[PDB]
Amino acid sequence: GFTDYKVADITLAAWGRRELIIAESEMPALMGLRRKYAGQQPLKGAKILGCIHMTIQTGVLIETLVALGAEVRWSSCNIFSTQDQAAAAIAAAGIPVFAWKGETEEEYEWCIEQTILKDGQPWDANMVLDDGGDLTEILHKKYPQMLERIHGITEETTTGVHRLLDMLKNGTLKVPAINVNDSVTKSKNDNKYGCRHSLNDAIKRGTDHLLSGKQALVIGYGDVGKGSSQSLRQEGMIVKVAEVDPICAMQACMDGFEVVSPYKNGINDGTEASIDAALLGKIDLIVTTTGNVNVCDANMLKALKKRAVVCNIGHFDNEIDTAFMRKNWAWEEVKPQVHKIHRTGKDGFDAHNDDYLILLAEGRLVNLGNATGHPSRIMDGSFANQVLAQIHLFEQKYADLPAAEKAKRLSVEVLPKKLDEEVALEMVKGFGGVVTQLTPKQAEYIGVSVEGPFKPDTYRY
Amino acid sequence: GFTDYKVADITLAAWGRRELIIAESEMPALMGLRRKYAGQQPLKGAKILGCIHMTIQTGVLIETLVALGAEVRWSSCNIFSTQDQAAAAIAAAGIPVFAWKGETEEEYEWCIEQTILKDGQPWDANMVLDDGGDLTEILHKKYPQMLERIHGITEETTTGVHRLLDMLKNGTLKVPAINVNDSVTKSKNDNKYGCRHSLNDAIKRGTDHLLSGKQALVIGYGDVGKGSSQSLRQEGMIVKVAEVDPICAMQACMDGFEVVSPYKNGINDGTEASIDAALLGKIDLIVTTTGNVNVCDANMLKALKKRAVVCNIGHFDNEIDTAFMRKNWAWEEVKPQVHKIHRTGKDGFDAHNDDYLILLAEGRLVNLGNATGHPSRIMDGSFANQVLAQIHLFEQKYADLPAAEKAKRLSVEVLPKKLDEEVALEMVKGFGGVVTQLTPKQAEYIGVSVEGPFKPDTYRY
Amino acid sequence: GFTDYKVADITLAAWGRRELIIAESEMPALMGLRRKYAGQQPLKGAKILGCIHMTIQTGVLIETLVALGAEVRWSSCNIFSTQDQAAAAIAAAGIPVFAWKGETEEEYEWCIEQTILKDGQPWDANMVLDDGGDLTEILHKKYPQMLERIHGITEETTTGVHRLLDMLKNGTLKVPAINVNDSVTKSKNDNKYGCRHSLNDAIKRGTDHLLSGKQALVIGYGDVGKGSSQSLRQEGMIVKVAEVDPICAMQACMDGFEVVSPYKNGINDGTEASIDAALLGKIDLIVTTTGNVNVCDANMLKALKKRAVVCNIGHFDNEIDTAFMRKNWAWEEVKPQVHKIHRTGKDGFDAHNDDYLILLAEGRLVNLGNATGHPSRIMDGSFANQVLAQIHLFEQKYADLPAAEKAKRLSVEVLPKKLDEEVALEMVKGFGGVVTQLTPKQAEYIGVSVEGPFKPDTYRY
Amino acid sequence: GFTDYKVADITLAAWGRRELIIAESEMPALMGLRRKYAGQQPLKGAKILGCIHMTIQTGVLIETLVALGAEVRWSSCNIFSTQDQAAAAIAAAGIPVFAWKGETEEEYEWCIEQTILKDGQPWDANMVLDDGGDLTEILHKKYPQMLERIHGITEETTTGVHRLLDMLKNGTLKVPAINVNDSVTKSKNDNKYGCRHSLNDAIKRGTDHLLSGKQALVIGYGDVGKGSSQSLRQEGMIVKVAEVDPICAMQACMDGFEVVSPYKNGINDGTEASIDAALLGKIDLIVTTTGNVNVCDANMLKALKKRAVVCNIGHFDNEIDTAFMRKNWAWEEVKPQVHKIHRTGKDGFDAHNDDYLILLAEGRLVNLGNATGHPSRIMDGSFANQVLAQIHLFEQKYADLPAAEKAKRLSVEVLPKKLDEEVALEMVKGFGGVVTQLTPKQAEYIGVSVEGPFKPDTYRY
Ligand SMILES: NC(=O)c1ccc[n+]([C@@H]2O[C@H](COP(=O)([O-])OP(=O)(O)OC[C@H]3O[C@@H](n4cnc5c(N)ncnc54)[C@H](O)[C@@H]3O)[C@@H](O)[C@H]2O)c1
Ligand SMILES: NC(=O)c1ccc[n+]([C@@H]2O[C@H](COP(=O)([O-])OP(=O)(O)OC[C@H]3O[C@@H](n4cnc5c(N)ncnc54)[C@H](O)[C@@H]3O)[C@@H](O)[C@H]2O)c1
Ligand SMILES: NC(=O)c1ccc[n+]([C@@H]2O[C@H](COP(=O)([O-])OP(=O)(O)OC[C@H]3O[C@@H](n4cnc5c(N)ncnc54)[C@H](O)[C@@H]3O)[C@@H](O)[C@H]2O)c1
Ligand SMILES: NC(=O)c1ccc[n+]([C@@H]2O[C@H](COP(=O)([O-])OP(=O)(O)OC[C@H]3O[C@@H](n4cnc5c(N)ncnc54)[C@H](O)[C@@H]3O)[C@@H](O)[C@H]2O)c1
Ligand SMILES: Nc1ncnc2c1ncn2[C@@H]1O[C@H](CO)[C@@H](O)[C@H]1O
Ligand SMILES: [Cl-]
Ligand SMILES: [Co+2]
Ligand SMILES: [Co+2]
Ligand SMILES: [Co+2]
Ligand SMILES: [Co+2]
Ligand SMILES: [K+]
Ligand SMILES: [K+]
Ligand SMILES: [K+]
Ligand SMILES: [K+]
């Protein structure tokens, strides 16, 4: 009798359920929270709007929140990141989900509205779980009355956290948020090792190209850039790295990479003459990891080696100037989320043309677009933090506080290190690792409790 | 024309000068500071007490301070870390230096005193550069009147910073200090990549042991532990990692290491029954990296595989219970800083005994004891921060300020991120790396200045 | 009106053609032969029975053989290795092909018969291209008269060559063969680096398991074992290696792997008491690479850690005792070529049972069964050797020769080193690599020609 | 007492003996032969002329030969490769040895003659152990009557085997020889992994340069070139590889290296204009590994980046045109075996000249000249083959055979694979590895004995 959903094929639910059962055995921290908190039901009464990639891993996150007492309405934060068997299994469980792989931009917006509205009217939501900030901005711009009764936002990714901090700076953030990205068991696990696992994964599934012996250029060397560069280098690629941050560039040099710039002397003056055409003429694969705009621009695309692969693993697809390629070049679909971009003109192409580029996921997040994103055992850390962040903000009950009390708690904060450590401990135990217990003398020698926390907040790991 | 020094062999000065000239070509950030601030002469009047490993790298640091206007009196912070040709070259340049490789503990204390006192009476020092805090504590415990004329302390390493913070929280810190260690171009360069370069280097010079295919156990996975594990793994060792911090252990698992404890279930009950004898019976090499006490204890040493190598790369030698071995086991010197510890007895050993351990540098920090420590191009980052930290505190002139302003500036702080980035930039240029310059639109997009700083202070890299 | 084929779905032909166009640009050695030999038509009159994995890469091989003048009738040598879009593209080109992914065993035997028979009568073939030797043995055991007109066999893989050598020493081999496997551009490219690329690829596609931090056991350390071990180790797995060959075990040790046996002291007495249960109880992934029988036996499977992944990348599925699992344990299909094997027994599994193993491709070649096998740029080397071998034996015309001179040519040979090098050179050029030309003085100095061959036949590379 | 020796410092004997006792525990194959054969005395009556690097490892080899019953007279095959404490320890055991680190070329020849002659007349030698072929050449050209009574030669290295085969081809080889180099436990252990261990080791001891993030060019990708490339890559260097063998170049590409040539298009046109100056102007370190002549020629040396390090790890120094640098450029000794080559003129140099190269070991093999060569556990394999080869040829008694029998046995051969495997087995056991024993069914399946040999002679490993 349940119809409050829209997925690609509900008959895929049994397959999704089999994969959810597997993923549970791969996510000990998330399943540890399920057992620890099921009796006390900390999310009883919570009504969570969720917008994050509708994968098998998100499925385990959704059912954990529900198991702790929440009701949810869910959509994906990307048009290509949904796993249809995951969405089908969630909808089969009676959970409102509006997501499928290959949405159009209009369908993407429609799916978010379907979570916001129930039976044509605003849902009685009181919590928000977001990845990238799209759902968060729509609520602020269009549904401010709903935010009055929402207790908090838990944001997954670097880009979303940037947008939250902009709203806080401008005095336009309406409810407090927890920066889930900057838990060490998120940023230094998800962003880095997740992309290490899934970047070459997506490139292989999309192209089946040998990577060993070829030239790669990674734009950026943050957490995603670090993991992305290792994903290619461990496959045998000759990887060069571009960065605007000299500290990250220093790490790239020390990690054994040649730090280069697409522009002569690193100065992009807007002309084709500032492009290091000799450098780009050798690159077989360029990956953007910056969260910035136009870091693989039109003039870089013009100068790339013939038949090079172009992909983005940053959150939004404007890191590559795909708009330029649509306006000027002919797109030939090899298969879903794999396109040959013929640089010979806009209208038509010789099917045996050799002057083309291969674009993955149409410039969207390549790991989730052409593969399945991060593996369950890595997302275990990010999503255990998500559950702890939902519990924390829901227990605070910001929406119920008076005006003078709301003002003292309107912030974008991170979880305490003690909880960060406790998530990490379950992850380590999941590998069969054994952490040593400090003796009382040792604990006093380095000035910490035997239980932790073991590092000051300034520690960078 | 100069006789206020004490080195092992002044005839080594020409050799040391030849290596100093090479090291300058390997330290562009430090030498870059030398030229930029040369005419300004910002350290004129500075009289710096310096206590840090008297290596060739420290030699370039000393002559950078002198070139900027400073007068110094120097000693080493470790008995085995001095390079005798470096100390000879410094002494030959008319700089008071009291350091040589192979000091006794008595001679170690005498060397720090020869810097503190000039011609029988206390020097009119006004600045302090320290590595580990031994000189800092002597000043506070034995020469507190000299601290009245001292403007600040610049501390190199993790252990010294811990001691600085303890004095601050007890109200005993007499002068402000700069945590040079927690610059990213220090901790995430020196502590990590330095030990990656110099750990296997020191193990090779001491034993010439093949490392590939053997079993290692690294105690600790902080910055030193991360670099030490990679030093051994990149040589092909099978590395297991012990940690008390679950977050660091999580990093170790994701980095591809098995996380183990020397104690069953990680619980040391002080008894041999708690030792995982099967695990330690397979370890060919153990390395301590914790900055903690007794992390390789007497019971672990008894259970270690025969002929296993024992060494420490933390700052102080008490990470290993060498006192137990001195009390109970016979020591056979193979060569300087290499001993066979025969577990068959104290008062004699069969020349062909098979039941022994190999101890490097008598438990003192092994990279400087059995090799030359970190390479010049890495210490470039650390010591560019040291010079900047000295310039900062000396310009503050804390000692000449009223009491109301003294208590306001009495702190242990780090250099601004902007200087951290400018140090990193010179290091990248030294590799031939080219950093990209943000366009104005990109800088506005991510909310930074084109000049930087490029990261929020919370960023962990 | 061409209907002489059987594929899964001919409407996939255009997709396959798009991927064949890309594959051609990834296979410069194969496409170089196609253009070097097109006008000469060296395979005019050749009628080739081909039996090898019907992949995109095989498609480029087939169309190369056709472009040089040959007629072919093709099947796949494995029930799971066909790429249906590749089979469709070939069938759409008017080429008899009988292959689809997911054949039953009876359909597999039927497909080879459809190549052997045209219109119910034995085809007038004169060449054989084989991978594994199944087609070769059927011709010898069932169609011997057909071998009177066959000029030669070109065998792709290690297992197939073993079978050819057994027939040669028994005097049952009726036509000469070329050992394509033992070209250096095959065995030391395909067998090693191919599995390096495609082993972790298949495991990710089948399970999406995180590999970093988990425990793997690779049975065997030949060419396939070496590449498989590197596939897992580069992902951060802790890899242990098993071997019966001490020389190969020595290489594993030096490469940084712990060498272990599933049996106590390496002695398999057939009892569970000989299984090293403590070792296998920690293994998350076992991979067989031996070409031998029952190297992952029933008692090993009983002792494996719960939820461990089991797969074989050797040629035949009897490396793992899947017959035991099919007889005693309950199989739950997750998706095609992914089965959970519940060790709770044979009569009903619980969907939430935790005591299962995950078997990939039902024990068949996992890289081809769960992914797409080796990438085009690697198969370029193997299939360029295939073309040269087919040319060589077809030119010899063994079947049209005197009996005395036929006996002089009945042999299992490898291609000459000069052609091996010429294949490698085109692969090197495909990477943009530039080899150096020896000067005549240098060529004399080492006793070679400037043109090569550069190594004696004893050289092992 | 005993005076039949010449070494640097006899008082180093005790230190050398302590390191010999350690090395015995690192060489289980060599010590296993000592244990297995001591009672049989297989070398009773053997009188071995030995010319090979007088290291600690050669010391264990010498004492194993003596322990099996032989007498020896020894010299080093390189002027810089002797460890003076090893030579002193051997002389102190009453064994004739003529070697010291830092010989002149004239002293090198004198040392070899001191082994050949005892008390001014030819020694009653009957066996030869050689590394490089210098001793072999002198006997053929100057002492042919001694070769009448010599039963054979055991040659260690690739360059020496080449010289043997030249003499055999020309009919000038007077006694049979065993190619020790081409045992797999030699060439694929010593040549590869030995240089992996000792190349970066020697570069660090000589220069203490940071290697990570810098540019290397390895000339050659044979066994030594493969090991040398890994030695630099595992340290974080950006390694480019040069080769003339396209098969070896193919392996470099697949191993993740860019394959380049010092000459434009790989062609030397006899002028500086054919030098890729852009490439060489970026190289921080060049290593020659070829066994060829002038692979780092004068014009390459002129175009190398300022302050680049230049070293050779081939057997002979003529891989680098050191003669050109001697004639044209000023040499400044940094320290023993480390020279700055000032490219500003032959006359003199400014101490602060930036235009110099750093040459290690004056172009002689750098691992032995600037460090200690391969570690004991690797040399265990090579030198166990040496002992077995000495036994095999001494037992054959070629010198006592009639002319007609000599003709049937005058050859350059390798040890049988069975012995190669038994050497490997002891090396594997030294790591704690456990080799699996084949079942009788498994042995029959792959067609080998359960005892081995396990591979055909064609197998390349
Ligand atoms: N696909 C995934 O699974 C996944 C996971 C986590 C984060 N992300 C996304 O990836 C992006 C990066 O995330 P992060 O956590 O690594 O952030 P980060 O801030 O740590 O790294 C981004 C880096 O890009 C560099 N950069 C910026 N502009 C540049 C330019 N023009 N050229 C070169 N370098 C430039 C910055 O210096 C910075 O170090 C974000 O959009 C984030 O949401 C994706
Ligand atoms: N020799 C060198 O060149 C060099 C360079 C830098 C720092 N250091 C020294 O090395 C030490 C470590 O420095 P760091 O920067 O890595 O500090 P860190 O705090 O970043 O790392 C130390 C780690 O040890 C772990 N640890 C503590 N007690 C433990 C125990 N009983 N068992 C297992 N793990 C345990 C902690 O959890 C922590 O992660 C300090 O003494 C520092 O001064 C030496
Ligand atoms: N799937 C692919 O893409 C692919 C590619 C090439 C070859 N293959 C197949 O893989 C198999 C191996 O090929 P290869 O070239 O590596 O052959 P190989 O002879 O070089 O290696 C096989 C190794 O297995 C070892 N071995 C045998 N029995 C063992 C046992 N009981 N325990 C442990 N080790 C044992 C042998 O010592 C040998 O070193 C063959 O069947 C071959 O046809 C598959
Ligand atoms: N120092 C040591 O410890 C050590 C150990 C073993 C061997 N060696 C010596 O090292 C040398 C190489 O030994 P190997 O066993 O590796 O021999 P190898 O034949 O296996 O490798 C040498 C390689 O050099 C390549 N080459 C030749 N001329 C070249 C040129 N002009 N440019 C580029 N590449 C070129 C060849 O193609 C060949 O692959 C020999 O002289 C040997 O005696 C030294
Ligand atoms: N430590 C060492 N002791 C003795 N011989 C060595 C050592 N290192 C390398 N060699 C040998 O030197 C030869 C090259 O001259 C190689 O064949 C190798 O076996
Ligand atoms: Cl010439
Ligand atoms: Co998102
Ligand atoms: Co110190
Ligand atoms: Co086959
Ligand atoms: Co030699
Ligand atoms: K996934
Ligand atoms: K140093
Ligand atoms: K493929
Ligand atoms: K050595």
Short mmCIF file of N, CA and C in Angstrom, two decimals, chain A residues 15 18-19 21-22 25-26 196-197 200-201 204-205 208-214 230 234-236 307 332-335 340 351-352 356 358 372 375-378 431, chain C residues 15 18-19 21-22 25-26 196-197 200-201 204-205 208-214 234-236 307 332-335 340 351-352 356 358 372 375-378 431:
data_model
loop_
_atom_site.label_atom_id
_atom_site.label_comp_id
_atom_site.label_asym_id
_atom_site.label_seq_id
_atom_site.Cartn_x
_atom_site.Cartn_y
_atom_site.Cartn_z
N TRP A 15 17.72 -7.39 -4.81
CA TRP A 15 19.15 -7.26 -5.04
C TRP A 15 19.76 -6.21 -4.11
N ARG A 18 20.05 -7.65 -0.57
CA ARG A 18 21.21 -8.53 -0.42
C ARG A 18 22.49 -7.73 -0.25
N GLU A 19 22.64 -6.63 -1.00
CA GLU A 19 23.84 -5.81 -0.89
C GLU A 19 23.84 -4.97 0.38
N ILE A 21 22.62 -6.07 3.26
CA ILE A 21 23.01 -7.03 4.28
C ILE A 21 24.53 -7.22 4.29
N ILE A 22 25.14 -7.26 3.10
CA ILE A 22 26.60 -7.33 3.03
C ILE A 22 27.22 -6.06 3.61
N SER A 25 27.73 -5.80 7.35
CA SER A 25 28.90 -6.49 7.89
C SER A 25 30.19 -5.74 7.62
N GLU A 26 30.18 -4.77 6.70
CA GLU A 26 31.34 -3.96 6.38
C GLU A 26 31.35 -2.62 7.11
N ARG A 196 41.04 7.23 -3.20
CA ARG A 196 42.07 6.26 -3.55
C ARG A 196 41.45 4.97 -4.07
N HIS A 197 40.41 4.48 -3.39
CA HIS A 197 39.73 3.26 -3.81
C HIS A 197 38.94 3.46 -5.10
N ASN A 200 40.39 5.21 -9.59
CA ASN A 200 40.78 4.26 -10.62
C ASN A 200 39.68 3.25 -10.89
N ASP A 201 38.86 2.95 -9.88
CA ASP A 201 37.70 2.09 -10.07
C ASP A 201 36.79 2.65 -11.17
N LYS A 204 38.39 2.68 -14.69
CA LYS A 204 38.41 1.35 -15.30
C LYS A 204 37.04 0.95 -15.81
N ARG A 205 35.99 1.14 -15.00
CA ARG A 205 34.65 0.74 -15.42
C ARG A 205 34.20 1.55 -16.64
N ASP A 208 38.08 1.09 -19.25
CA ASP A 208 38.94 -0.10 -19.25
C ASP A 208 40.33 0.22 -19.79
N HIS A 209 40.77 1.47 -19.61
CA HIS A 209 42.09 1.90 -20.06
C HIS A 209 43.16 1.39 -19.11
N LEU A 210 44.24 0.86 -19.67
CA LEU A 210 45.45 0.66 -18.90
C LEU A 210 45.92 2.00 -18.36
N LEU A 211 46.25 2.04 -17.07
CA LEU A 211 46.77 3.25 -16.46
C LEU A 211 48.29 3.24 -16.33
N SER A 212 48.88 2.06 -16.14
CA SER A 212 50.32 1.94 -15.98
C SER A 212 51.06 2.54 -17.17
N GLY A 213 52.10 3.32 -16.88
CA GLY A 213 52.93 3.89 -17.91
C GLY A 213 52.41 5.15 -18.57
N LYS A 214 51.21 5.61 -18.22
CA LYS A 214 50.62 6.78 -18.85
C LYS A 214 50.79 8.02 -17.98
N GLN A 230 47.24 9.16 -5.32
CA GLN A 230 47.67 7.82 -4.95
C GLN A 230 46.92 6.76 -5.73
N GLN A 234 49.52 4.38 -7.66
CA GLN A 234 49.61 2.97 -7.29
C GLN A 234 49.29 2.05 -8.47
N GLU A 235 48.61 2.56 -9.49
CA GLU A 235 48.34 1.81 -10.70
C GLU A 235 49.48 1.88 -11.70
N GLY A 236 50.50 2.68 -11.43
CA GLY A 236 51.62 2.81 -12.33
C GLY A 236 51.63 4.07 -13.17
N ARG A 307 42.80 12.12 -27.38
CA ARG A 307 42.20 10.94 -26.74
C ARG A 307 42.45 10.88 -25.23
N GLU A 332 29.70 12.29 -28.59
CA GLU A 332 29.31 10.94 -28.99
C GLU A 332 29.31 10.05 -27.75
N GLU A 333 28.14 9.53 -27.40
CA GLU A 333 28.05 8.66 -26.24
C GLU A 333 28.65 7.30 -26.56
N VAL A 334 29.71 6.93 -25.84
CA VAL A 334 30.21 5.56 -25.89
C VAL A 334 29.24 4.64 -25.17
N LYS A 335 28.90 5.00 -23.94
CA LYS A 335 27.95 4.29 -23.10
C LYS A 335 27.53 5.25 -22.00
N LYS A 340 32.73 10.59 -25.89
CA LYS A 340 33.81 11.12 -26.71
C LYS A 340 33.44 12.53 -27.16
N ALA A 351 33.21 9.15 -37.57
CA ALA A 351 33.20 8.14 -36.51
C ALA A 351 34.58 7.54 -36.26
N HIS A 352 35.52 7.71 -37.19
CA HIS A 352 36.90 7.30 -36.99
C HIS A 352 37.82 8.47 -36.69
N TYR A 356 39.71 13.58 -30.32
CA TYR A 356 38.61 13.61 -29.37
C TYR A 356 39.16 13.49 -27.96
N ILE A 358 37.79 12.03 -23.95
CA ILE A 358 36.81 11.19 -23.29
C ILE A 358 36.45 11.82 -21.95
N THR A 372 30.76 3.05 -8.00
CA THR A 372 29.84 3.03 -6.87
C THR A 372 30.30 3.94 -5.73
N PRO A 375 33.89 2.66 -0.76
CA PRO A 375 33.41 1.38 -0.23
C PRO A 375 32.77 1.54 1.14
N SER A 376 31.95 0.54 1.49
CA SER A 376 31.17 0.58 2.72
C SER A 376 32.06 0.80 3.94
N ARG A 377 33.18 0.08 4.03
CA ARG A 377 34.01 0.16 5.23
C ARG A 377 34.64 1.53 5.42
N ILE A 378 34.77 2.32 4.35
CA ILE A 378 35.24 3.70 4.50
C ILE A 378 34.07 4.61 4.87
N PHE A 431 38.95 -4.08 11.26
CA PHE A 431 40.09 -4.69 10.60
C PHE A 431 40.75 -5.78 11.43
N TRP C 15 27.33 -0.43 -29.89
CA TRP C 15 28.11 -0.18 -28.68
C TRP C 15 29.48 -0.86 -28.77
N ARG C 18 31.81 1.00 -31.10
CA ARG C 18 32.37 2.19 -30.48
C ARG C 18 33.55 1.84 -29.59
N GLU C 19 33.44 0.75 -28.82
CA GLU C 19 34.54 0.33 -27.97
C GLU C 19 35.67 -0.32 -28.76
N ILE C 21 36.59 0.76 -31.74
CA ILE C 21 37.32 1.92 -32.28
C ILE C 21 38.29 2.46 -31.23
N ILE C 22 37.84 2.56 -29.98
CA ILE C 22 38.72 3.00 -28.90
C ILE C 22 39.84 1.99 -28.69
N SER C 25 42.85 2.31 -30.99
CA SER C 25 43.78 3.36 -30.60
C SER C 25 44.62 2.98 -29.38
N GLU C 26 44.23 1.94 -28.65
CA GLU C 26 44.97 1.46 -27.48
C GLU C 26 45.89 0.29 -27.80
N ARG C 196 47.64 -7.58 -12.62
CA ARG C 196 47.81 -6.42 -11.75
C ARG C 196 46.69 -5.41 -11.99
N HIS C 197 46.33 -5.20 -13.26
CA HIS C 197 45.27 -4.25 -13.59
C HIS C 197 43.89 -4.79 -13.23
N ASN C 200 42.14 -6.62 -8.85
CA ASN C 200 41.41 -5.72 -7.96
C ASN C 200 40.21 -5.12 -8.66
N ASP C 201 40.31 -4.91 -9.98
CA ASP C 201 39.18 -4.43 -10.77
C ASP C 201 37.97 -5.35 -10.61
N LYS C 204 36.51 -5.37 -6.95
CA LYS C 204 35.71 -4.18 -6.69
C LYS C 204 34.35 -4.26 -7.36
N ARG C 205 34.31 -4.68 -8.63
CA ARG C 205 33.04 -4.73 -9.35
C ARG C 205 32.09 -5.75 -8.72
N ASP C 208 32.60 -4.51 -4.31
CA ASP C 208 32.85 -3.14 -3.86
C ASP C 208 33.46 -3.12 -2.46
N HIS C 209 34.16 -4.20 -2.09
CA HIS C 209 34.83 -4.26 -0.80
C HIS C 209 36.01 -3.31 -0.76
N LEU C 210 36.16 -2.61 0.35
CA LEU C 210 37.45 -1.99 0.63
C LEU C 210 38.50 -3.08 0.70
N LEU C 211 39.65 -2.83 0.07
CA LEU C 211 40.77 -3.76 0.14
C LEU C 211 41.83 -3.33 1.14
N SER C 212 42.08 -2.02 1.25
CA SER C 212 43.10 -1.51 2.16
C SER C 212 42.87 -1.99 3.58
N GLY C 213 43.94 -2.45 4.23
CA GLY C 213 43.90 -2.85 5.62
C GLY C 213 43.47 -4.28 5.87
N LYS C 214 43.01 -4.99 4.85
CA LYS C 214 42.54 -6.36 5.00
C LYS C 214 43.63 -7.35 4.63
N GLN C 234 49.20 -2.99 -3.81
CA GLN C 234 49.13 -1.58 -4.17
C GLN C 234 47.84 -0.92 -3.69
N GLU C 235 46.81 -1.72 -3.41
CA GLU C 235 45.59 -1.21 -2.80
C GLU C 235 45.69 -1.12 -1.29
N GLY C 236 46.82 -1.51 -0.70
CA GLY C 236 46.98 -1.46 0.74
C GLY C 236 46.61 -2.72 1.48
N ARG C 307 32.96 -14.60 5.98
CA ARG C 307 32.73 -13.56 4.97
C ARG C 307 33.97 -13.28 4.13
N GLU C 332 23.72 -18.62 -2.27
CA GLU C 332 22.82 -17.47 -2.41
C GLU C 332 23.45 -16.51 -3.41
N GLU C 333 22.82 -16.34 -4.56
CA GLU C 333 23.35 -15.43 -5.57
C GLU C 333 23.07 -13.99 -5.16
N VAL C 334 24.14 -13.20 -5.04
CA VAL C 334 23.98 -11.76 -4.83
C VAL C 334 23.59 -11.08 -6.14
N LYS C 335 24.29 -11.42 -7.21
CA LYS C 335 24.08 -10.90 -8.55
C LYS C 335 24.88 -11.84 -9.46
N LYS C 340 27.10 -15.81 -2.35
CA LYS C 340 27.40 -16.10 -0.95
C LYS C 340 27.23 -17.59 -0.71
N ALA C 351 18.86 -15.47 5.42
CA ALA C 351 19.31 -14.30 4.69
C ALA C 351 20.23 -13.41 5.51
N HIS C 352 20.17 -13.50 6.84
CA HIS C 352 21.03 -12.73 7.73
C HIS C 352 22.13 -13.58 8.36
N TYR C 356 29.27 -17.13 6.04
CA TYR C 356 29.29 -17.43 4.62
C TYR C 356 30.63 -17.02 4.03
N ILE C 358 32.14 -15.51 0.10
CA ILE C 358 31.74 -14.90 -1.16
C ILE C 358 32.61 -15.47 -2.27
N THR C 372 36.46 -7.07 -17.11
CA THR C 372 36.65 -7.21 -18.56
C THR C 372 38.01 -7.78 -18.91
N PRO C 375 43.42 -4.97 -19.95
CA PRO C 375 43.10 -3.83 -20.81
C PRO C 375 43.74 -3.96 -22.19
N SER C 376 43.14 -3.25 -23.15
CA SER C 376 43.55 -3.34 -24.55
C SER C 376 45.05 -3.14 -24.73
N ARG C 377 45.62 -2.14 -24.07
CA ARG C 377 47.03 -1.83 -24.28
C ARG C 377 47.95 -2.95 -23.80
N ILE C 378 47.50 -3.77 -22.86
CA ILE C 378 48.27 -4.95 -22.48
C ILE C 378 48.03 -6.08 -23.47
N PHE C 431 53.35 4.35 -25.47
CA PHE C 431 53.46 5.17 -24.26
C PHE C 431 54.14 6.50 -24.51
#
